[PDB]
A paper describes a structure:
To further confirm, we crystallized the phospho-[name] (3C, TEV)-pUb complex after treatment with 3C protease. Treatment with 3C led to displacement of the pUbl-linker (1-140) from the [name] core (141-465). The overall structure of pUbl-linker (1-140) depleted [name] (141-465)-pUb complex was determined at 3.3 Å, and showed similar conformation as seen in previously solved structures of [name] in the autoinhibited state. The crystal structure showed RING2 bound to [name], which confirmed that RING2 was only transiently displaced from the [name] domain in phospho-[name] and returned to its original position after removal of pUbl-linker, further confirming our SEC data. The crystal structure also revealed that the REP element was bound to the RING1, similar to the autoinhibited state of [name]. Phospho-[name] was bound to the basic patch between [name] and RING1 domains, which led to conformational changes in IBR and helix (connecting RING1-IBR domains). In the asymmetric unit, two molecules of [name] bound to pUb were seen; however, in one of the [name] molecules, no density was observed in the IBR region. Overall, this data suggested that pUbl and RING2 exist in a dynamic state in phospho-[name] (pUbl binding<->RING2 open<->pUbl displaced<->RING2 closed), and compete for binding on [name].
[name] is an auto-inhibited [name] E3 ligase activated by dual phosphorylation of its [name]-like ([name]) domain and [name] by the PINK1 kinase. [name] is an autoinhibited RBR family E3 [name] ligase consisting of an N-terminal [name]-like ([name]) domain followed by four Zn2+ binding domains [name], RING1, in-between-RING (IBR), and RING2. Like other RBR-family E3 ligases, [name] binds to an E2, and [name] is transferred from E2 onto the catalytic C431 residue (on RING2) of [name] before ubiquitination of lysines on target substrates. Furthermore, C431 on RING2 is occluded by the [name] domain of [name], which inhibits [name] activity.
Author numbering:
A (entry chain C): 139 to 353, 356 to 378, 393 to 405, 413 to 425, 427 to 465
B (entry chain D): 1 to 73
């Protein structure tokens, strides 16, 4: 049968309201039907995230479709065809048995940062990392990305791109992150929030204007100084270094086929094809069985 | 699907959208309800000001997720 190993994790909103293992699915990007026959199965995450990146031929005669669309669903309940969960692509099963950079324990699953060393942190530590940082307003605001965090180790060029990873905050803290991000967005834009208590309504005034009226009738509505934040006046204002080494995601070769028993791996693509002509079998590298639906859904590829 | 547009006042508006809806469409939908011209609307999600020519799916904005509205004067 197909092993119950999974490589893909999503966030279920209902009813799991937590991070669960995910199912990978595919379709013709044109007909939105399950008719796309992939040229080569996905090997990296880039394949299942970057659109129109994977090519094939839609088997419907009506489609001119040549591109594959990848969606993810939960792996814990009967999922309707409509119930797509956001795939958190930094989370991976710790098959390699690496150490949370913060907590120096082998845990699974873990989040691998896109820092140059491909650092690994476990979800629990990552949680604490986000909780401290968020409330300490030490979340980065790149106007081109949004509110995010880099490598815990402070590695450069590591800012988390998929901002849905911050659902690891939990619903209360995530909702705050949504607020905190919007707040910080206005401030760093040079905009202001209402100084009046119970308002907090974000405003983007004229670039050079000290007089800001908080004003459909949806305003404060109150006028203030863009400087001292008073009623507008014509007057004057008033990580362990060692644990970072042992927490790198890169710190099996060939196996014989279950039939022709000749040694065969294509990147991370777990879909193997026996090269011998009297064999020509499709087999899973992990499960070990004949390439099937569950294997596709659980771990088409591995990290 | 349905999304919530929350102003920092706490003011929440309920909108009927689809993943294919562009931010431009979303803003027009807000104008249809509240009456705020799209020209005065600045929508933020995940702490990024959302661009008009991107769809909710592009921003991975999920069913019953929450957008933020900030006004330009
Ligand atoms: Zn679930
Ligand atoms: Zn098609
Ligand atoms: Zn940990
Ligand atoms: Zn790092
Ligand atoms: Zn106000
Ligand atoms: Zn002043
Ligand atoms: Zn064989
Ligand atoms: Zn398998």
């Amino acid at each position: 049968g197909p092993s119950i190993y999974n490589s893909f994790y999503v966030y279920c909103k209902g009813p799991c309201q937590r991070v669960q293992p995910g199912k990978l699915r595919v379709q013709c990007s044109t007909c939105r039907q399950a008719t796309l026959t992939l040229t080569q199965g996905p090997s990296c995450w880039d394949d299942v995230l970057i659109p129109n990146r994977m090519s094939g031929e839609c088997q419907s005669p009506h489609c001119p479709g040549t591109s594959a669309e990848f969606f993810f669903k939960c792996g814990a309940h009967p999922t309707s065809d409509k119930e797509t969960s956001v795939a958190l692509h930094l989370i991976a099963t710790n098959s390699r048995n690496i150490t949370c950079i913060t907590c120096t324990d082998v845990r699974s699953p873990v989040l691998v940062f896109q820092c140059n060393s491909r650092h690994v942190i476990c979800l629990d530590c990552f949680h604490l990392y986000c909780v401290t940082r968020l409330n300490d307003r030490q979340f980065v605001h790149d106007p081109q990305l949004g509110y995010s965090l880099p490598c815990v180790a402070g590695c450069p060029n590591s800012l988390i791109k998929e901002l849905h990873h911050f659902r690891i905050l939990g619903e209360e803290q995530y909702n705050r992150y949504q607020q905190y991000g919007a707040e910080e967005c206005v401030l760093q834009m040079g905009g202001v929030l209402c100084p009046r208590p119970g308002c907090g309504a974000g405003l983007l005034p004229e670039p050079d204007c000290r007089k800001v009226t908080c004003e459909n009738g949806l305003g404060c509505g109150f006028a203030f100084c863009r400087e001292c934040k008073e009623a507008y006046h014509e007057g004057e204002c008033s990580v362990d270094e060692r644990a970072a080494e042992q927490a790198r995601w890169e710190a099996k070769t060939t196996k014989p086929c279950p039939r022709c028993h000749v040694p065969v791996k294509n990147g991370g693509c777990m879909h193997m094809k026996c090269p011998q002509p009297q064999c020509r079998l499709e087999w899973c590298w992990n499960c070990g069985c004949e390439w099937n639906r569950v294997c596709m859904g659980d771990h088409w590829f591995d990290v | 699907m349905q999304i919530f547009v929350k102003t920092l006042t706490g003011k929440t508006i309920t909108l009927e959208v689809e993943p294919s809806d562009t931010i431009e469409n979303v803003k027009a939908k807000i104008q249809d309800k509240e009456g705020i011209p799209p020209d005065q609307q600045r929508l933020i999600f995940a702490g990024k000001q959302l661009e008009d020519g991107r769809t909710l799916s592009d921003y991975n904005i999920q069913k019953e997720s929450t957008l933020h509205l900030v006004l330009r004067l």
